[PDB]
Amino acid sequence: AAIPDEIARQIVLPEGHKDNVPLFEAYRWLRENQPLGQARVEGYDPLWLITKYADLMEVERQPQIFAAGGGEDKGSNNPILANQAGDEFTRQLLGGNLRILDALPYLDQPEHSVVKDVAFDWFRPANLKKWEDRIRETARASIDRLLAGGPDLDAVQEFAVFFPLRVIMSLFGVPEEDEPRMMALTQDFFGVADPDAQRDDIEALSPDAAAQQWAATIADFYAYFDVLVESRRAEPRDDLATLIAVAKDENGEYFPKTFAYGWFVAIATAGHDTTASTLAGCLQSLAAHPEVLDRVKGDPDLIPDLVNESLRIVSPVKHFTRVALQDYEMRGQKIKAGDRLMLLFQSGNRDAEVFDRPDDFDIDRRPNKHIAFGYGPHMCIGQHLAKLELKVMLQELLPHLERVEVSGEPKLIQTNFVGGLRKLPVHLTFS
Numbered sequence: 088a089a090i091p092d093e094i095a096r097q098i099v100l101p102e103g104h105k106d107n108v109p110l111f112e113a114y115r116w117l118r119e120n121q122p123l124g125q126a127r128v129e130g131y132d133p134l135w136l137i138t139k140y141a142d143l144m145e146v147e148r149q150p151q152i153f154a155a156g157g158g159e160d161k162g163s164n165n166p167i168l169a170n171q172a173g174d175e176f177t178r179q180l181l182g183g184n185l186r187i188l189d190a191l192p193y194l195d196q197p198e199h200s201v202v203k204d205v206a207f208d209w210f211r212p213a214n215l216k217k218w219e220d221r222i223r224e225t226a227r228a229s230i231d232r233l234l235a236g237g238p239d240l241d242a243v244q245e246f247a248v249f250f251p252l253r254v255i256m257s258l259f260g261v262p263e264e265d266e267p268r269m270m271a272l273t274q275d276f277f278g279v280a281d282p283d284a285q286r287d288d289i290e291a292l293s294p295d296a297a298a299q300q301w302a303a304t305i306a307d308f309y310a311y312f313d314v315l316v317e318s319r320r321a322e323p324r325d326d327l328a329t330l331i332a333v334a335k336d337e338n339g340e341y342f343p344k345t346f347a348y349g350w351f352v353a354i355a356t357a358g359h360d361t362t363a364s365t366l367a368g369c370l371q372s373l374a375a376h377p378e379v380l381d382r383v384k385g386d387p388d389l390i391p392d393l394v395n396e397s398l399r400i401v402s403p404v405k406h407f408t409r410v411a412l413q414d415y416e417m418r419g420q421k422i423k424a425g426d427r428l429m430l431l432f433q434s435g436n437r438d439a440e441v442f443d444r445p446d447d448f449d450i451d452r453r454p455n456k457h458i459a460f461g462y463g464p465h466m467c468i469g470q471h472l473a474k475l476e477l478k479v480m481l482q483e484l485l486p487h488l489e490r491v492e493v494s495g496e497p498k499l500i501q502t503n504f505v506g507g508l509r510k511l512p513v514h515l516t517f518s
C-alpha cells in the first residue's frame with residue numbers, strides 16, 4: 088500500500104522539515120516498517136521514498152536506469168522536488184520542460200560527464216591544497232571578529248555564514264562588496280518554501296509560489312553572472328570563474344553561457360550554504376556533547392572525524408529526485424518506468440543496518456561511512472573543498488573555545504531540499 092498520509096506529508100512537504108524531531112522520526116518509521124514505499128501526497132507526483140542506505144547506493148550507481156533530468160527527453164524530470172503546480176509553472180515558462188538550469192543536477196550522461204569534466208580536476212583534493220593558506224587566513228580573520236564581538240551571538244547569522252561565503256567568493260573571483268548580494272540570493276534560492284524567506288516580487292500564497300521564487304532568483308543570478316562570464320572571457324584571471332567562463336567543448340566552441348551560469352549558481356549557493364550549516368550543526372553538537380569538544384582540543388587529529396560525524400548528523404542536502412527509465416524491482420517492490428524517486432540522504436545517514444546507535448553523535452566511527460555527499464556520478468563535486476574548509480576552521484577555532492552553550496531556540500530553514508540551521512543563539516566561553 089501507499090505510505091500512510093501523515094508520514095508521507097512529513098517528508099514530502101517543506102513544512103514537514105521545520106523541526107528535525109518529527110522529520111527524523113518519520114524517516115525512522117519508514118526504515119523500520121516500510122523502507123521502500125510510494126508517497127502519494129496531494130499536489131505532488133507519487134514518489135518512491137528511498138530511505139535505506141543500501142538502496143540509495145543501488146539507485147545512484149545505475150544512472151542508465153535512474154535518470155536525474157529524464158534521459159534523452161531532456162528536462163522531463165525535475166531533479167529538485169517541486170509540487171505539481173510548480174512544475175506546471177516551469178513548463179509554462181520554459182515551454183514544455185523543467186530544465187531551468189544547465190547545472191550538473193539537471194544533466195544525464197553523457198552530457199553530465201562532459202560538463203563535469205570542466206571542473207573535476209579543480210575540485211580534487213591535491214588541487215585544493217594551494218588554497219589551504221588563504222582558507223586558513225580567512226578562518227583566522229573570521230575568528231578574530233568572533234572574539235572581538237563577545238560571547239553572546241547567533242552562531243549562524245553572526246559567525247558561521249560568513250567564512251564559507253568569503254572562501255568561495257574569493258576562489259570564485261567575486262569581489263567582497265558583492266558578498267551581501269550573493270548571500271541574499273542564496274537565501275531566496277534555498278528559502279523558496281520558508282515563510283520567513285519570501286521574495287517581495289512573487290505571489291507568496293500561489294500554489295506555484297516556490298517555483299516562481301526559484302525562477303525569479305535564477306533570473307537575478309543570470310543577470311549577475313552574464314557580466315562575470317563576459318568579463319573573464321575578455322580578460323582571463325587565475326580564478327574558478329575563469330576556468331568555467333572560458334570552457335570550450337570538443338569542437339573548440341565555448342559551452343553555451345547558461346552552462347557557466349549553472350556552475351556559478353551551484354557554486355554561489357551550495358558552495359557556501361552547506362558548509363555553513365555543517366559548521367553551525369557541529370557547534371550545536373559540541374554544546375550537547377561538551378566531552379567531545381574537550382577530546383578534540385586534546386587531540387586536534389580528531390578534527391577530520393568530527394567533520395565526518397557533523398556531515399553525517401547534519402546531512403544538509405536532503406534529496407534529489409530520479410525517474411525510472413525502465414521497470415525495476417528493488418526490496419520486493421516493482422518500480423515502473425516513469426515513476427519518480429526521492430533520495431533521502433538524511434535517512435540513509437541514520438540507517439541502523441550501517442551505523443551503530445545511528446542517532447548518537449560518535450566521532451569514533453572509523454571509517455565513517457556517511458552518504459551526506461550522495462553517491463554515483465552525481466556525487467558532490469565540492470566534497471573535498473567542504474572537508475578542507477571545515478577542517479581548517481575547526482583547527483583555528485576549537486583552541487579558542489572552552490565551552491558552547493545554546494542560550495536560545497534554534498531555528499531550521501523550512502525546506503525539503505538544502506536545509507540546516509538559520510539561527511543558533513549561543514553563549515561561548517573563550518579560552
Ligand code: HEM
Nearest residue numbers: 191192353358361362404459460461462465466467469473
Ligand atoms: C557540507 C557540504 C556539502 C554537502 C553535505 C553537499 C551535499 C551534496 C549532495 C548530497 C549532493 C547530491 C549528490 C547526488 O546526487 O548523489 C551534492 C551535489 C552537488 N554539490 Fe555538494 N554538498 C556540500 C558542499 C558543496 C560545495 C562546497 C560545492 C561547491 C563548491 C558543492 C557543489 C555541488 C554540486 C555542483 C553538486 C551537483 C553534482 C551533480 O549533480 O553532479 N557542494 N552535494
